[PDB]
Amino acid sequence: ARPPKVQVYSRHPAENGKPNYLNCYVSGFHPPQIEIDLLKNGEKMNAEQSDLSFSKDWSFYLLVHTEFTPNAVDQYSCRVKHVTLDKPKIVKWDRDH
């Protein structure tokens, strides 16, 4: 059992009020059962999930993505629950990192 690594990032560098895509990339995890939520101000967004694939080392990877438009007010995060984690992993989206 290996834990998920999590990256939350935008497809293009983020300009307030310009339409973009928000990505949560989750990888290096085993087993494959996992819950990946994009959150806006702490609430689940309706985001499409890629098909379950895996790497040379058998560890799984998923992309959870949706259209969004950044602005000064709205806070985004990604929340990952896995057998390997006692409490949910939350990574906050920083437009810079």
């Binding site: 290996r2 990505n23 087993p31 098909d51």
Partner: protein
């Protein structure tokens, strides 16, 4: 380097439902082009790239039949491996398999592979020769024996040497527009004073294809690999990739550092500095 066609199977047991779930995805290089999921109602092999939709109903009907056969046998295969490991029917277990052909300059197989894994550990691999197998443990040795008994290595070898490279060449023609053009990275360098002690310089590569790329930081012909943070290469969402490399530098010294970007789609390696 070389073009490749590869399939990733995942069978997972579901004790609560008293069944199993079978996933397939198919890849040419770093581009997904098909999926299957035995949980889909009326499950079929589905297209997941623009270029594969052009195939006819006979193509989709065969890939679907193999998928469904693969799903039904892999349910017993999970039960078989449970037995060999004396495991309870209370636990979920996973059976992974990956196989593909790389394409040699001549139009023949360069390298072919066919490995499987149980709960994420190597189980059996077909050896480079495509004539023999290697087994991880006692369970896998039992499985290795049956394969030898049934001359399975020749069937994999025939597949990898014939059909696999035949259809890989077929697919590289079908999606030439996408699979065989390089997208160079769009690059920029950002500056964030993140403490009093040090300024963060961050070198971005965005929207590049394929996945392979080289990010490095320099200062007076001296590489700063040791010091820089390099994120895992991640998907853009549109079939391209992104990556960044950050390093911390003394205040006043930002323009003394250069970021180096090597990728297939650049005429020659790139050299950026901040503002």
């Amino acid at each position: 380097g070389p073009h490749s066609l590869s399939y990733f199977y995942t069978a997972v047991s579901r004790p609560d439902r008293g069944d199993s779930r079978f996933f397939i995805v198919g890849y040419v290089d770093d581009t997904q082009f098909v999926r299957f999921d035995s949980d889909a109602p009326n499950a079929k092999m589905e297209p997941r790239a623009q270029w594969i939709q052009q195939e006819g109903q006979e193509y989709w009907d065969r890939e679907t039949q193999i998928s469904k056969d693969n799903a039904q046998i892999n349910r017993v295969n999970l039960n078989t491996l449970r037995g060999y490991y004396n495991q309870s029917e209370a636990g979920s277990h996973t059976l992974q398999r990956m196989y593909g052909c790389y394409l040699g300059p001549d139009g023949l197989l360069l390298r072919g592979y066919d490995q499987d894994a149980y709960d994420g550990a190597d189980y059996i691999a077909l050896n480079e020769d495509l004539r023999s197998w290697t087994a991880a443990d006692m369970a896998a040795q039992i499985s290795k024996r049956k394969r030898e008994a049934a001359d399975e290595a020749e069937r994999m070898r025939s597949y990898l040497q014939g059909r696999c490279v035949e259809w890989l060449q077929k697919y590289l023609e079908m999606g030439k527009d996408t699979l065989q053009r390089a997208e160079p990275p769009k690059t920029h360098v950002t500056r964030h004073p993140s403490s009093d002690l040090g300024v963060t310089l961050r070198c971005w590569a965005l929207g590049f294809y394929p996945k392979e790329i080289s990010l490095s930081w320099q200062r007076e012909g001296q590489d700063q690999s040791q010091d820089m943070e390099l994120v895992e290469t991640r998907p853009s969402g549109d079939g391209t990739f992104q990556k960044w490399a950050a390093l911390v530098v003394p205040p006043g010294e930002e323009q003394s550092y250069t970021c180096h970007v090597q990728h297939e789609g650049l005429q020659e390696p790139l050299t950026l500095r901040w503002d």
